[PDB]
Amino acid sequence: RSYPAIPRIYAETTLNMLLKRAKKPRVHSIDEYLKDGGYQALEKALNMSPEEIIDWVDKSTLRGRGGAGFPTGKKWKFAVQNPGPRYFICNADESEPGTFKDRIIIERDPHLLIEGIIISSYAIGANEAYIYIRGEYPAGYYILRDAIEEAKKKGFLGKNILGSGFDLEIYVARGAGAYICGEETALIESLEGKRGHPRLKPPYPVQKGLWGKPTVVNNVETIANVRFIISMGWEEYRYIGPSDYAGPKLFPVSGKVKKPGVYELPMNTTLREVIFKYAGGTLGNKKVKAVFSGALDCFSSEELDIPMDYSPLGFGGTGTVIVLTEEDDIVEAALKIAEFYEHETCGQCTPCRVGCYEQANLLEKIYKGEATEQDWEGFDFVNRNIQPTSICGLGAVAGRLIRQTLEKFPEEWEKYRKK
Amino acid sequence: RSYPAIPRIYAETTLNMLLKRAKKPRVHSIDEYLKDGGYQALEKALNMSPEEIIDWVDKSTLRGRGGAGFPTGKKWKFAVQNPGPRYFICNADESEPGTFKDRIIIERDPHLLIEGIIISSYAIGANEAYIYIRGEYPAGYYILRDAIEEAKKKGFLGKNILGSGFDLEIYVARGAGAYICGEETALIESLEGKRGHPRLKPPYPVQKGLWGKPTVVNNVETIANVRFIISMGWEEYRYIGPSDYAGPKLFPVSGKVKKPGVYELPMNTTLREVIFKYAGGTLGNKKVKAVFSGALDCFSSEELDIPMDYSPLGFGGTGTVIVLTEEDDIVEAALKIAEFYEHETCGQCTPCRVGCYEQANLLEKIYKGEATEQDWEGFDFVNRNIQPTSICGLGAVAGRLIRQTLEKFPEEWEKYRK
Amino acid sequence: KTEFEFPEELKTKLQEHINYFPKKRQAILLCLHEIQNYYGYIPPESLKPLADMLELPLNHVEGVVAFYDMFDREDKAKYRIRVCVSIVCHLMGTNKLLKALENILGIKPGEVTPDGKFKIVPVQCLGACSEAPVFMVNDDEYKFESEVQLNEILSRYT
Amino acid sequence: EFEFPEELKTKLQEHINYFPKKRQAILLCLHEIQNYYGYIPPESLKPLADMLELPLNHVEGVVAFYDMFDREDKAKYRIRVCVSIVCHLMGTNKLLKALENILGIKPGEVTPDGKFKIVPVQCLGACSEAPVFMVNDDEYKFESEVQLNEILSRYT
C-alpha cells in the first residue's frame, strides 16, 4: 500500500546479516523475504523443542541490544521457570537521542523481526506477543500491521502454525510521546492501558509482567538476531566478530560526520573506525571534540580508540554515536541533554522529578549568562542528586553525560562561570 | 497427527460460507466444526424425508460445480426413480490446469464436505459412499481418513446414525495420475479396480453406475453447498447472489495477478472484478492479454466484462481464472495446453488418441520454428478433428482453447507461420 | 446541544481498536490517536464516551491524555508540524528550520496559523538523527534542507 | 519366489479388507508397494494379483495406465515438478535449473545414489503457488535456489 514518508537513512554493512535487505531504503515484503530463505529458520525452530531453542540462544552469547546488555538466552530461562501463561514483547519504543537503528529493520525488513518474534515466542511458550512501537513511528506501525497480515496469510501466524500445535497472535501497540515507555515496566503499564510509570524492580517482568504473568521484553535489534542463531546454529553465529562480544551490531551514527547513517559492524570495531573508516570522517575535516553515546555518556577525543562492545572500557550503551567537532559548544550541547531529561521524567520519584527540572532550568540560566553564584552551586548540586530513591534507570543517568562534560571540558564550563 | 506439507494457498470470501473456516490455511477438526453449528444440518436432514431434501436441493437451483453445471436436485431425483441399492460418490479428482478450489475445502474444512456427503447419501438412500481423491493430494487423503474417523466417533457415521435407522460408511479411494479419472464414468471404472476408461453415456450413472447400480457423482464444491441449503432453507439460499444464478461460488485465480488464490464470490461478479477488484490486479500492472478458463476456453481482454455465472454469455466452466499479460507468448501457452491433452487422452477413441498426440507434436514443431508447410496445415486439420467419434468430453474440448487462440490472436500465430 | 456522540465512521474505527487486543482497555492509546486524527485534537467532551467504550473511569482516561505528549486537548490543527528540538537536530540546524517555518507560515513553536491549518509542535528526538534537522507533517517525516525546499514540502498539504 | 515382507503384506491386507470388494483396493495397494520399494517391482505384481483375486494381466494393465507408478527406476524421493501451463508461466524452468544446479540431474533422471528422481508431472492443483513441486508427499512453492536447497536438505 502507500505508507507515510520516511527519510532515506543511509545504511551500510560489512556482515550482510541484519542489513542484508535493510541496506536498501524500501519495504521488503514477504515474497522478497521468502526468496532469501525467509521463515526457513522458523520452520527449523518448530521442529526443535522450546528448551533446545533457549539453549542455542544462550550459547550464541547474544546480549540485549536495548542498552543494558542482559544475556538473552538467560532472560528466557528465567521466564520459563515460572508458570504460564507467558507473554513476549518486542520493544520498539526507540526514543533515545541519536538512536535510529531499530526503525530501519522495522520499516525495511519487517519479516526479519516478525520471524524472530515467532521463534522467541515459541521458545518461551507465549501464545500472545506484542510489538510496542513509539507513536512517532507511524510508518513503522502500518508496515508492521501489513507484514503481520502477510505472515498470517502464509501460515506463519495463527493457530497450529505449520502443523506444530503452536498458536501465536502478534498485536501491535502504539506509544503516544513518552520516552519512559521504553523502560520495560512502563511499557507494560502502557500495554495495560495506563500511564507509563515504571514499577519497582524486582520483580522483573520475567517473574511478574503483563497482567502479573511471566513476560519477556526484548529490543527489536536483539530479536532480529534470532533468525541467524537458528539458521547458522549457535556455534557459527558465535564465530562472528570477537568471541567475547560475538555477532553483528547496528551503530546509528549522526552529527558532524560525512556519512551519517546506520552501520552493521562487528563489535571489535573501534569508535575511531566507526567515524573515520566507515562514516567518512568529519564534516569539513574538523577535529572531533566529543562523542555523545546517545544521552548516556560523553567521550572525549582522547577516547576514540575504544571498542564498540559491552566491555567496561568499551563504548557500551546501544552503540549510538553522535559526533561533535571542535567548534561545537559543549555547554550548549549539555543543555540539550538536560532538556531531554526534563521533558521525559515521569515524576514518580522526587529527586528525579525536581532534579531533571532544576538541572535544565539552572543550566539554561548558565547558558544565557543569567546565573547567580547560587545558581551555579545549585546546578552542581542538582546534577549530583537526581538519582537518589529513583526506581528506574532514567533517574540514575539523567546527570551522567552532563557530569562527564564538566569533568572532561572544564575550560569550556569555566568560560560560562566567568559570565 | 502430522500431515504432509501443503502450500498455504490464499483464500478470501465476501460470503463467509464455504470458506468460513477454509479461509484460514489449517485443518479444522470436528470440535471446531461443531462449535460453529457443524453437523446440525445433518441432524435436521435426518428428521426430514429424503424426498423433502431432494426438493430443497432442487428448489435451491444448485448446479454441479465440476464443470458441466447439471442441476443437482434433478440428478438426485433421477437416481431415486431407479431401484436400489444406490451409491453416492464425491468427485475429488480435481486435476484440470489452474483448478485448486476443491482441495482447500478438503484440506481445511473436511467436515463441511463429510456433512454434505451424509446428507446427500441419505437423500438418495445410499448406504455406501465414496470419495475419489486424486493421488497427488496425499495430505487431503489422510486428512479425510482422519475426519471420517472423527465423524464415526461422534456418531455421525456407521449404523443407525443418531437413532435414524440410516446406515452409512464413507470409503476414501485414491487416484494414481490420470486426469481422465475425473470423468465420472472413468472414475467409477477406477473405483471398480480397473483402468480409467470412460463408458458410453447414456446410460448415465444415475441409471447404471458403480456395479451397474444407480450412482450419483457430485463434485466436492457441489456437495459443500448441501449443509447450507438444509441449514438456511432453499429460499434464503436463493437470496445469495443474483436471483438467476444463486449461491456461493469458488474461483481459483492464478497466473499474472498480485493475489493468486481462491475467492468465494457471488456469480454476478465479473471476470474484470475477479482480476482487479479481488485478486489485486496484474503483476507489474501489465495489460491483460488473455484469461484461460482452465484448459477449456480462452477469453481475450475484450471479454472481461462477462459475469462469472452459468449463463450463455457467462464465464462458465469451473470458474478457473488463469491470467496471461501482454508479454506472455500465446503460442507457447497454447503448446502447454496441447501437452496436457496429449498426456491425458485415455486412447479409446481414434481421433482423440491420434489427434491429442499430433496436436502437441506439430504445435511443438511450430513453436520451435521447425514446422513444414505441411505441418502447419496438418496442425490446423488435426486441431479441428479430435472430437469425431469421441465418447467423453476430453475429445470434445481438446482442440477448443487452442482454436480460440487461433481466432483471437491471429497476428501472433501469423508470426510463427512466417 | 446534546450529549456528545462519536460520528459512526469514527465510532466504527474506535470499536475495531477496542476489539483488536484481548482486553478493551489496551486500546486506549490507539483510540486517542484515532480521535486526534479525526478532530485535529482531543475534544474534552470526547473522553467520557470513550471511557464508557473502554469500560474505564473518566479520571483514568483524563490522566492518560495528560500523560502522553502527542495528545493535544487545547488546539485544533489540520496539520501538526512536529519539529525536533533535541541535540542532533539542534547541532545540524533546528533553528534554521524554525526560522524558515516562521518566514513561510508566520508562527513560532506552540502556535497555530489563524486558519487552523498548521500548528508547530516542538518535540524530542524523532529517531531520524542522521537526517537532522528532522520534522514531521502529521505522519510524514522529512529532512529540512532549505526554506525553498521546505516551502515546496508544505505546499503538498492542502 | 518373490514374497512381500510381513509388515508390507499386513498393510496390503488392510487395504484389501477396506472396501466391500477386494479388487477396489488395487490402487491403494500399488501406492503402498511403491512407497515401500521406491518403485513398483515387476515381480510384485503376480503376488498382488493373487491377493486381489485378479488376473496378472489386469494388474499389469493398471500399473501401465496410471502415471504415478514407476516400474523402472527406484528412488527414495520423487521430486515431482509441475510442467503445466501456470507453473510454466511462473517459472518451472527456474525450478528445473535450480534442481540441476543442486542435484546434477534433469527430468526423468535419478541421482547416482538412488536418492532423488525428478518426475515431470501435469498440474498439481496448487497453481496460485506456482511453480510447484512435491518431494514424495510433501508439496512446496519454489521461491529460489537458496530456498530449494534448504528444503531438499531436510530429506536424508
Ligand SMILES: Cc1cc2c(cc1C)N(C[C@H](O)[C@H](O)[C@H](O)COP(=O)(O)O)c1[nH]c(=O)[nH]c(=O)c1N2
Ligand atoms: C528510561 C529508559 C528507556 C528505555 C529503556 C530503559 C530505560 C531505563 N530500555 C531498556 C528496557 O527497559 C529493557 O532493558 C529492554 O527493552 C530489554 O530488551 P533487551 O534485553 O535489550 O533485548 C529501552 N529498551 C528498548 O528496547 N527500547 C527503548 O526505547 C528503551 N528505552
Ligand SMILES: Cc1cc2c(cc1C)N(C[C@H](O)[C@H](O)[C@H](O)COP(=O)(O)O)c1[nH]c(=O)[nH]c(=O)c1N2
Ligand atoms: C475429462 C473430464 C475430466 C473431469 C470431468 C469431466 C471430464 C469430461 N469432470 C466432470 C464429471 O464427469 C462430472 O460431471 C461431475 O463430477 C458431476 O458432478 P457435479 O454435477 O458437477 O457436482 C470432473 N468433475 C469433478 O468433480 N472433478 C474432476 O476432476 C472432473 N474432471
Ligand code: SF4
Ligand atoms: S527515576 Fe524518574 S523516570 Fe524513573 S520512575 Fe522515577 S521519576 Fe519516573
Ligand code: SF4
Ligand atoms: S474422448 Fe479421448 S479421453 Fe474420452 S474416452 Fe475417448 S479417447 Fe478417452
Ligand code: FES
Ligand atoms: S535529535 Fe532530532 S531526530 Fe534525533
Ligand code: FES
Ligand atoms: S499448473 Fe502447476 S500446479 Fe497447476
Ligand SMILES: [Cl-]
Ligand atoms: Cl476487556
Ligand SMILES: [Cl-]
Ligand atoms: Cl471380493
Ligand code: NA
Ligand atoms: Na505470494
Ligand code: NA
Ligand atoms: Na535439533
Ligand code: NA
Ligand atoms: Na527506515
Ligand code: NA
Ligand atoms: Na491472547
Ligand code: NA
Ligand atoms: Na459455520
Ligand code: NA
Ligand atoms: Na464462529
Ligand code: NA
Ligand atoms: Na422439486
Ligand code: NA
Ligand atoms: Na489446502
